[PDB]
Enzyme design. Sequence first.
Site, PDB file in Angstrom:
ATOM      1  CG  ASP A   1       0.012  -0.429   3.012  1.00  0.00           C
ATOM      2  OD1 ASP A   1       1.108  -0.845   2.572  1.00  0.00           O
ATOM      3  OD2 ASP A   1      -0.349   0.818   3.425  1.00  0.00           O
TER       4      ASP A   1
ATOM      5  N   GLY B   1       1.992   2.678  -1.971  1.00  0.00           N
ATOM      6  CA  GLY B   1       1.531   3.756  -3.379  1.00  0.00           C
ATOM      7  C   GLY B   1       1.095   4.956  -2.993  1.00  0.00           C
TER       8      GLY B   1
ATOM      9  CE1 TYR C   1       2.542   0.441  12.123  1.00  0.00           C
ATOM     10  CE2 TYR C   1       3.841   0.465  12.703  1.00  0.00           C
ATOM     11  CZ  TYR C   1       3.146   0.181  11.507  1.00  0.00           C
ATOM     12  OH  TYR C   1       3.089  -1.057  11.089  1.00  0.00           O
TER      13      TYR C   1
ATOM     14  NE  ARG D   1       5.096   5.211  12.835  1.00  0.00           N
ATOM     15  CZ  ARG D   1       5.478   5.483  11.371  1.00  0.00           C
ATOM     16  NH1 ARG D   1       3.946   5.422  10.524  1.00  0.00           N
ATOM     17  NH2 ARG D   1       5.081   4.042  11.365  1.00  0.00           N
TER      18      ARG D   1
ATOM     19  CE  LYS E   1       2.351  -3.320   9.562  1.00  0.00           C
ATOM     20  NZ  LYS E   1       1.940  -2.729   8.057  1.00  0.00           N
TER      21      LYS E   1
ATOM     22  N   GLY F   1       8.063  -5.240   9.412  1.00  0.00           N
ATOM     23  CA  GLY F   1       9.774  -5.824   9.029  1.00  0.00           C
ATOM     24  C   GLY F   1      10.432  -4.216   9.008  1.00  0.00           C
TER      25      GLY F   1
END
Lengths: 271, 271, 271, 271, 271, 271, 271
Positions: free
Chosen positions: A32, A34, A152, A154, A183, A208
């Site tokens: 994703d 992109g 996440y 952030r 995730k 990753g």
Amino acid sequence: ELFKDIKNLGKLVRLERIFNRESEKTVIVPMDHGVSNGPIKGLIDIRKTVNDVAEGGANAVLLHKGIVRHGHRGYGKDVGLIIHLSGGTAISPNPLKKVIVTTVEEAIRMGADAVSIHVNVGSDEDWEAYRDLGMIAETCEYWGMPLIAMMYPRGKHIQNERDPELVAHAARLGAELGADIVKTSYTGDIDSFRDVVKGCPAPVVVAGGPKTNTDEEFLQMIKDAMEAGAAGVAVGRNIFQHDDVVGITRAVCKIVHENADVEEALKEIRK
Amino acid sequence: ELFKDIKNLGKLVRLERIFNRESEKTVIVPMDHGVSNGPIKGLIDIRKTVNDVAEGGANAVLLHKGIVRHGHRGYGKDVGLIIHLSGGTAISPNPLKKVIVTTVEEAIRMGADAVSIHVNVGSDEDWEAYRDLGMIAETCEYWGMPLIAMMYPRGKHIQNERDPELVAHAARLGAELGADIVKTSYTGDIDSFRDVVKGCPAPVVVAGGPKTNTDEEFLQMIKDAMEAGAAGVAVGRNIFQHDDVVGITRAVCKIVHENADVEEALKEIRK
Amino acid sequence: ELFKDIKNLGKLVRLERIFNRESEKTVIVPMDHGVSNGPIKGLIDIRKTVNDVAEGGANAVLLHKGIVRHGHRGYGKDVGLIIHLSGGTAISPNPLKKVIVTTVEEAIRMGADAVSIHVNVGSDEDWEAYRDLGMIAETCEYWGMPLIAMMYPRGKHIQNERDPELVAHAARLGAELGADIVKTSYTGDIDSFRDVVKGCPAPVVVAGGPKTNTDEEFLQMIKDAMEAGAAGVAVGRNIFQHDDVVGITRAVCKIVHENADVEEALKEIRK
Amino acid sequence: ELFKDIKNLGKLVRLERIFNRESEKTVIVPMDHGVSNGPIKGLIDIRKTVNDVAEGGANAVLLHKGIVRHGHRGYGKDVGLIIHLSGGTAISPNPLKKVIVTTVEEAIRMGADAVSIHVNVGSDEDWEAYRDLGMIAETCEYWGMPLIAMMYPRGKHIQNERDPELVAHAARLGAELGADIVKTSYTGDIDSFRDVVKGCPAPVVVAGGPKTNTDEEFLQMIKDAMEAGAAGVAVGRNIFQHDDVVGITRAVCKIVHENADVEEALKEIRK
Amino acid sequence: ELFKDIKNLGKLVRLERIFNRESEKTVIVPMDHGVSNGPIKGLIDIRKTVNDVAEGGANAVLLHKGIVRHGHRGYGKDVGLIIHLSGGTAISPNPLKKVIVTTVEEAIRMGADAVSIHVNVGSDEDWEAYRDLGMIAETCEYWGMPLIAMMYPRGKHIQNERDPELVAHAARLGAELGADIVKTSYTGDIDSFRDVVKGCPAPVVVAGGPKTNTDEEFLQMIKDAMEAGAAGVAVGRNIFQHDDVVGITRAVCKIVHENADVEEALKEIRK
Amino acid sequence: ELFKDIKNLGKLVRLERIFNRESEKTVIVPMDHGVSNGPIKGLIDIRKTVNDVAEGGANAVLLHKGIVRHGHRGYGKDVGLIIHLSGGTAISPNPLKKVIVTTVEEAIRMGADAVSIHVNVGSDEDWEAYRDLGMIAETCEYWGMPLIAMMYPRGKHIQNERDPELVAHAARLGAELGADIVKTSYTGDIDSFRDVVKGCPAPVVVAGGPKTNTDEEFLQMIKDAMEAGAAGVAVGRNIFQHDDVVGITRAVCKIVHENADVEEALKEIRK
Amino acid sequence: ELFKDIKNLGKLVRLERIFNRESEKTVIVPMDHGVSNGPIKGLIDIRKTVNDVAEGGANAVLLHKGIVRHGHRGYGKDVGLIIHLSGGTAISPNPLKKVIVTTVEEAIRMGADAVSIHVNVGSDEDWEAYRDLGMIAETCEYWGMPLIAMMYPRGKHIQNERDPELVAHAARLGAELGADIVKTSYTGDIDSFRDVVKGCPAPVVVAGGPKTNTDEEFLQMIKDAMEAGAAGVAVGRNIFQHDDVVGITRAVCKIVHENADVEEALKEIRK
């Protein structure tokens, strides 16, 4: 059993298409980038990256509705389809801002097996995202659609996005709000990450991260993450930007589905 | 062919009215400047200009709804009708702000063959537009209405709106979110623009830009853009503000539909 | 091939779970008799039967909402799930009356891969069913849900429910109204049935019927039906009421997926 | 001037795709018999029949949603698409019963240029159809969708379905309720039919009927009908069940669009 | 357990209030006769009947919404509340006609723990009820409301409403359509009823019927029914029309929850 | 002529009640100042002002919903009713902020003949108003309700609200977005205003402005405005705050409907 | 009796599952810290904490929907379930911001007995929360769902969040807006808190606050709070972060339900 506590026939049925029956683990390949980064190495020819990766082991892939209507082959073996619902770009005056750009209904009528949302906990007006995750979790519960929440830490006041406590908190937040799978970033060491895993009621899939220096370092991280309790991994660039996409995913699959040691899986990267 | 993936009967049928069967290219003439700039040369007598370029073999035009109810020829080549959904003005305290001013349903019940939206990626709260494009893409998918997304890198922190990477990103963004066709600025050189074209899964139509100096320059840009991979062009001012509207469009059509060179083209401009 | 002209992503994706990639044929086992006939031999222990038919070839099963939430293998060969939407009973004062008892939405949120409806063309007020099929076809088109229309010529003024003309008409009726696949009775001979197949724009699956006197007769009918153009078979009683459920389905699969003959098939029946 | 009193931008735009700009007449080929009669000569290979008649110069065809997904070509000349909304069969216990089987929304999202409904005035509970026509006319008005109402005097107490007064009444009924165009039987003589035409505010298209026996008779009927005031013809079997589909339609087009006399026409049929 | 296959958090939570944790059986006392038969012995003073039956060991009580808004104790013994959705009367020109008189939403906003519907399989236009049961089952699934379907073989062509095959069919019908629990008549002998129980995927509760002769016959029927596989009993008149309501229910509870025998049961009846 | 290209039966019918059949011009008297300025001279006794302005010639007044329920009479000459949808006050911390305070539906169920909206192009977050005008235009199109858009260039960075270019832009903006009629300030001279009129596809009505100290001056402005192309005038204070309301409107009507000269006109003011 | 005035059947029924019949008091254990603070001591193994707190005699638990889907058991004394609707985190750039993350409908279809919302009166844009509480109170009234409003005086200009006047105000605010029960901080002394209780029309439940230094201090606070008029307590950390969860809750229950004294209650905590 992994999800042996969810009262939702539809979710179970679809989760069967993203997890391995035997290992009860999963290898997801996010494609994703992109939207947030633009055309990058590996994502120019989607059907190529997708077919290969599938041939290499992957269980499912992550894609924006705009790209599904294209990269469909129905040729080689089949992989699960996860449709991303969030949007945001690097070129935006506020990169951390994520917005819902696709509805759950759209995803299910496209034959998706799951949907994902991205939440930057700690960013400006992130509470708006809390509501989004919360409401979407409900529509997902109704449609029997598995929801993956990418949590996440952030924001302006967060220096270390990999801090153990923050990551553990973010992961728990996603489960608390109704996500079926979470995730998130690997904290760096097996012990702290184990805290993230045990502190979150839902299976946790590790990210990753950016392209790693050596295939050993990368494969080692995944190995450690699994030994910590991860239910799988969601690797993007480290896989499709590699020289041997088919081989590198083979390695990842070896480690994640066969508990194969790094030294072994590493021999799959055939040039 | 062109839309080889498109799996929507309605969209195909309507796209046949904006693209040339033989060349699989398109010449669109945007005539929506009235909203953002006010009455300008060439747009005072719409019915005249319409049939002017329409007579010049233009495939379709791009009007706002409050004009089509007026601008109804009934003669001259039947051209496609694209209804613009976005609104914003230069006199506004924030010129880059675009808002949805027309619904997709309105457009279809007016007999439109496609709808277009404008997204200034990088502007203030542009994420609100991401959601707009995303949601509108879905209603478009439902009504079988072709969607043209005009993606432009514009905002406080963007000096060069023609930067290759930014434009390529913006174009990809539109395809990722569900647009069928993408409108955007030509980067300046055949090589960089080719990257924009190859980095975007959907056909890319190039913008003409404000009225240029010499015709040769203008016709050369279009020639280069086509050779780079463009699926057509969407020229506004350079056409209807020209001295010979019918002739200049003829030139454009020659280059775009018949692959002619600049020298040849100019020969159609009677003045 | 079978499906090239279905311009709908969701339907394709789901049809892949009911048809065999290689043979482009399908073996469906209807297990909905519980509603119309009550508990019958073979349908008392659903998980057993569904499992038996599964670890033996069938690519999908047909059940009613209140049975899926019950017999669910989860451990074995994955078979497609088709949810029946029609209801009617033998004990009713009008056995031929069929009514919609389940919505398409319910089926999709249960993870179904397709839905089916039963239409007794020629029965009292059968036009009400025409409307049902018509409207349901539309909601199916919207959700990307494959629709199987079981068309049968049954009513007061119909002596031969296997008449070639009537059956061909009924099949065509289903396709005309929007069904993706049609279920119907085999006419008796290869030539007349071939007319049914060629007169219907959609793939035709043949019904097994009530208990045949022998396995050779039964397997021969299927063989002839396939050679006539059928896209698969939908056998109920002849399979789950057999002494060797696993073997008899193996035979059917041999004939349907491998074009194998009957002597080679009969062998599959482990007696 | 045909449509003048039409103040519906959308309807005008779409009507332009079913009527000839110059003659202001129309040649429509109904191919919906599949639902009411089953697979008949000429309707087995739809894509074939559609192409041929379109080569014939015919302006548009009339299908059922089921067939559209089986008649797209992009091969030769394009023709208008009219989607039928009514359903009923000969095998039904009440052949004259017609029911709405497709919605107007479905038709427009398929790219249709018009929709048609069948009303058997005089049949059992035909008032239910009055309401249908009435309500559908309104949704059509809203979506800018041209509506063709096929009005026929059929029922228990009607011996002559071609009676001038009844046909004139039925036609008027359709216009009164909101139809834009009316389909109906030719009364037999130029004078009585002229009454039908003058008594109906909307353009009237005449039906071909079953196979008259000789080219001349058929072409004569059409000639007389036109001279009476018809705005075109809607011929089914007489055209696609002919030996030379392309030629016979050529004849019809000659008579309807070029006012040619039968002598010249028949010259088009290569027999 | 009893509901092992039930995947629905809401239904589980509510079923816990109508079934006994230890025995996994249930004693329900229907008190809805007021609608079908009028004021009868035992149902004049509802709050009275409701606490004595609650003192004895009743787990739940069935009542029409209008009765519910009345008989609330707040002292005594808290029992489950089941709201009846069906209506029909003996004084009606068609006693077997049942109609939905209360919605599922009404029941849940009244704090009900379950809803029940009555279906006379075999009565005039009973298919209308099939649809009702089917649709209501879906709304019940959505609100997490346990649904009890009371299935009875009743109609013009049914002489023996206790016929084993018919009852087994009717029971299966209810489970197939989505009911969670099924109410029905005891067939007369342990063996035939065992067929009803094994032929129905959902727990089956047996009906008491009209006042049989003595407390031994009645208690024996219940004993046999339980030994056949019943998940409990739903006794009305035999309990609240008894001389010692508290005692007779005690007996029933003894047999159903403690597996006691008729002898050491009569000991409950305080004469 | 005037309302030529307009295709809406409902709009035409209602526009006939605000425009003069013969002159195709209109004299509107805005009486909505109560909301933005409070009770001012002339607006205290609404029924009085409304009966007077009626007698003097007026063809329609303009009030907010809560005042229509006051200025209604029947006793006198009938005038059109235009209901204002915008709200904003001088006492607000942002006087240029306008919000929708009444819906189009409310207006039509009150018997209104048209609705009006105020848009301060150039004010803070004015894009929110663009959307408002856009969406309201659509609902207006649906209900056949004529929409008057009062477009004014006002904001922080606008010194001259009467600048020709800005006014011409604002006027065009309203037409482009779907308004049927546009209200705006007279630019000062016949030539510049003629540009506003020719640059806007929709009829333009001119505003009277603040009471200037001569009637000759006032009547002259209206005369020039008309000669420039205005389709009428919308005068508030200059009329109802005049000493001879009936007479001054008579003057305006003379100039606007009879093309009088500013001389014969003044002979209407008796006072 | 407590809730005497409440004229809501559904609410009464459900309140009976969170309050003790005899004492008319309640012991609630909040376990929602996972969202605002992350995984903390005692909340890692929810099913453990929950069944232990349940075992200790607490009435109902309170969690987010995401967590209810896991920690549920079919054994031990089943406690009430309260579903939290508010969300907000410590890691957020604005910790006091609370947003609705779950709908009332979701809670009721999960079998909840009550829902709770958190309102930080005095925080930034807290009026948005006033609206939330207000609107949610209405939907709660409709579904017969008991609403617990946790009112706290927190914001930039509030130094003492335990100030008697502020707390009393906050509590009254909750009741005024429709809450059935109010949660809030104990003011510190019996007299001031008694003012909070008497100034609020709805029952008040006191919060435990942070983990106390000693069991005596904590149990003393609860004792004083009850003697002031509290209708129960809602203790989180002080209970599940204790060494003897079962024992400490036993103590709380002793004090709250049996009015026992701190020391006699302290005799329930084992090392």
